[PDB]
Amino acid sequence: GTVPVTWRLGVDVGERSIGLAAVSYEEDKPKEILAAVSWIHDGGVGDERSGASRLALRGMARRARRLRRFRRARLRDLDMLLSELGWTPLPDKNVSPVDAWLARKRLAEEYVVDETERRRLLGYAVSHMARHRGWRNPWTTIKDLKNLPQPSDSWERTRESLEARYSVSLEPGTVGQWAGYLLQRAPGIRLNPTQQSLSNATAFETRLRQEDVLWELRCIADVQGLPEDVVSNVIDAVFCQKRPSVPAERIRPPLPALHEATGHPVVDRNLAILRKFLSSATMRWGPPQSIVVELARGASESESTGYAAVALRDRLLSYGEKNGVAQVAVFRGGVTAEARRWLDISIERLFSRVAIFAQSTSTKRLDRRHHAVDAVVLTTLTPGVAKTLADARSRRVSAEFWRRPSTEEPQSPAYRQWKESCSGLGDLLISTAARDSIAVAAPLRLRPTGALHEETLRAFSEHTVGAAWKGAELRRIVEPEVYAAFLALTDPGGRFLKVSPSEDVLPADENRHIVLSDRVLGPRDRVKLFPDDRGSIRVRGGAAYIASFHHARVFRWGSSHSPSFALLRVSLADLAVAGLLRDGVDVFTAELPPWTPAWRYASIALVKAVESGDAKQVGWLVPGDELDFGPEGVTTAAGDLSMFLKYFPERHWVVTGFEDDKRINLKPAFLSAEQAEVLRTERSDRPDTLTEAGEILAQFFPRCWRATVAKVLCHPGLTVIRRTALGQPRWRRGHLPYSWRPWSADPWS
Template sequence: MVQDSVCVYCGGTIGYLTCQLDHIVPQAGPGSNNRRENLVAVCERCNRSKSNTPFATWAQDCGISGVSVEEAVARVRRWRNIQDGRAQSAQLRRLQKNVIARLRRTDEDPEIDARSMESVAWMANELHHRVQSAYPSAEVAVYRGSLTAGARRAAGIDSRVNLLGERGKKDRLDRRHHAVDAAVIALMNPSVAKTLAERSSQRWAQRLSGQEETWKSFTGATPGARDRFDSWRDHMLRLTELLNAALAEDRVCVTENLRLRLGSGNAHHEIVRPLARHRLGDGLTAVQVDRASSPALWCALTRQPDFTPRGGLPPSENRVIKVHGRRVTADDNITVFSQKPGDDAAEKPFAAIAVRGGFATIGLTIHHARLYRIEGRKPVYAMLRVFSHDLLPYRRDDLFSVPLALQTISVRCAWPKLRAALAEEAATYLGWVVVGDELEVPMESFTGGYIGGFRKEFPNITRWRIRGFESATVVKLRPNVLAAEGLTESVGDVAKIVGRGWRMSVNVLFSTHPTVVRRDALGRVRHSSAAGLPTTWTVR
């Protein structure tokens, strides 16, 4: 299948030595979605300009001639096969359909989860060797995944266990199917595994040859094997009862490791942009002051007698400030962060640090979020996203309680009402959360929009997982037990909530007084810890 030496994005001519492979839709977090439908050949100019952005989002304002969603779709529809044939044509049509769907996407792919990163075969063999080394006298066996599937079918467990999703087959929508697999493997033994392998061999042989299918009645080649298989089936029925009881009592927990230490990854985005320069005497808006290129400059500007949080710093030809002991007069230039040409005076503050004479954004380096209640006639809940850069001086301290000065980039990028409350000491610190934290949310008040449609399908889901801090006032959640890999459709309220996430106002969400659930390695709720580990708490 070829693109006729044409860049999918702009239509320019590309060759073997000049083309570059690009991901149409990037993936949140590290890594990439390397499936065929997400990869296209493009020119170097488009690849550099698009960077780590969904094509449909980039195409709206990139300014390159020939770049638009509809033009790219038209180019894909002109793709042709190298070889003729019905199978190749059907394959090409499927590929075109999937590529076009991705060209229209404006949101990123979900982060890579543990299941998609790990090779089950490699992990099984590695575990086999380690267990055998630790216990030389133990009998350790490694079974193929198809035997686990055969065991579930032979015992009828998929139609009996009350997981969410479609009954009668393994459904990956409910993450707790991993627990079912683990339980099935725990009951496996060499004799049953041999019988299951023989059943599978008979099944394919009978289907390929058109013979009568008798493999379902086969329970072993010897009387002893048949007895062991029948006993195993009885145990599997009992396992089904135990699993259903545990599911009904919410004792099959989905857990996730929390990142609590400062990471050692990139401290900022790789692209360094130029700083915007302003003559000090010409004045600055309040948001321009908040985009000052250093905490020291921000302090010098905000401590001027005529500075106000709303009006900023008015023009003054007599203006003189000191930054790190250096005298700056009205005719001198000061520097601020700006992502817009010419520095839009209304551009809101964003997370960035000065780097090599310019600046780089740090929006992806949020270590944790602190939750506050702003006191008043009606309490308001707010969130302070704490960037790793502001925590670097406190590596050896409790990162979740160290003081953050008003000039830190974390506070400067906070919701203005929270900033004012922090300055006036009118905000009560309630606790902290990180990406991956589990929330138990009272859902009774959420009846409209996408979440209302989702709740009609899954009315009993109350446990959610934090997947990101979208802005100073919005948090993104996903259902704790549901996985996007199990979705059968890419549209609808369920697909939007499970796939893209539930974006919720911080004040609305935490006004319901959810519980932040912390668990130990066995999934038990941790209410206290002598070792100082994170414990469960409820927003009050």
């Protein structure tokens, strides 16, 4: 089903986006824009706060797990050494908070003549020193730690500061003696400072070093008269540390292929999108005859010869030598902007965008389709013409700075031939923009991997059986068997929970017995409850909130001419507690038990409609799905959304999240984020230079449309559009995610 045409490929690579064009050619002039799509990616970023990528967060978590594993193994080996020496380690409970510190202070101060008491104090001191040993260089050997100046100069400065503050001198002033003395003298004192966060002045200021703990242990050994091999073994067990190695980063030569990852996140996202587009374009129109790529001027902050440019040249030249691409040329930013400038093509005129800035011309970054338009413009480019345009800009910027207290055109026959050949490019762009064939899409994240819950462990609340129970207290029951038993109490014919959060579900009953499969709970027995009336799971003996939702399952019930819709918001914790995070599981259609937080905190109408059997699952929505409202647009606008839709009549909206049980958060697909953020900045510091549409767009972002699901899915002709790699909506029901209509979708199974 491949019809070979003559077409060229245009790729603009940005920090958060990539624009791609397949332009069919007839006589070395543009003939047909086959596909133009801009793909918005996160560049591998999973933490928007710190800018850390998903791979970096995963590596930090994995190394934290490995640190805990090695710490557990090292402390177990120390415990076996202390058992071999007969020294008793510090017990888990039923000891004073300062037994370890007082043991360290007493062994570093005086000699202990009692045998069992000395061994007990030595075991307490050595176990506590292994739990708190301070930092050393990981490449420094134990022998090199022993060759360090003991004590360290930072601890000498700290000890002099402590002697100045408290007017006392301890010989020898180890951290064990000073901490024990300060915990006896000024109780409640903090020992180490916190950079995270009334005037509890800390005892120490610098980070503890392993040489100081080693010096204190050797001072304790010299005072107590321990044998040399015993001291050597105790040092080698307390300060044991794995040396750093290189397991994973194990780095004419053959150029890498398209399917091979490059290791860097932004380049990997751009490579994956370009690889999918190139594969689909090859299967539908044959191979391209050249590939023109525009790396951005950015994409490195905190002809291009950057790492992204080198990786893209090597992989696209691998594809070229495997498929027959005649040349591959990669340019440096921002050549395509001036190439768009000389043909009189503006995004604000091409897509009929209203003006946002009162003074000066608005930046093209407002409409996200500018990437695909730049890819179309890039398709026409050649390296000689790009050189002439770069020389023209370099000549123009100096005359522009000179003429402030120009514009002069450099002459080129290749530029003249290019401008003659690209006369109809503007007409093609108008024609393709009129029928809305230029698409802005985002890649879907469908794998159920990530943080399963929030990190903060929370304390359990607790409720008696025999008291009065409200709806929130029913919803917060931790144990699923007790939850199902209270479910059978409040509704014996029901399988799900349909109560208001504030209503009084059931009164006090002094002889209520909750029967189970393994015990019987009396009316005086106390049920473990989640602390708050929100989605939570039981992890490691505590409660944690659920993370962000993986998806929302769409349910429909009622008549054909007027149905009702609701979302079942499913997080990774629901799939974790349902046992669905395993092999061979379709996580969008698998049945969730009633005790999951999804079905606990679903809307009451959805619960009652599923219990009545009327409501069936007709589809699913992930963050990043595109809602095409059709040519009608949004007919249920109210509030600031109406004033937004007067000047930006958007029909394509992107799902970002599901903020409660009845609402879905939608942003406009074609409108950018950072442009509206700098509009907010100019609203903050430059009054009256912003138009009314700019003011409304600045107020609309960042939270966009917090939209009622009943007000969204009540539109006939609304489609959940899932694109192919070329930016075309997938309408054939296959094994890839397809476009569907909420008003007409078949029920699952």
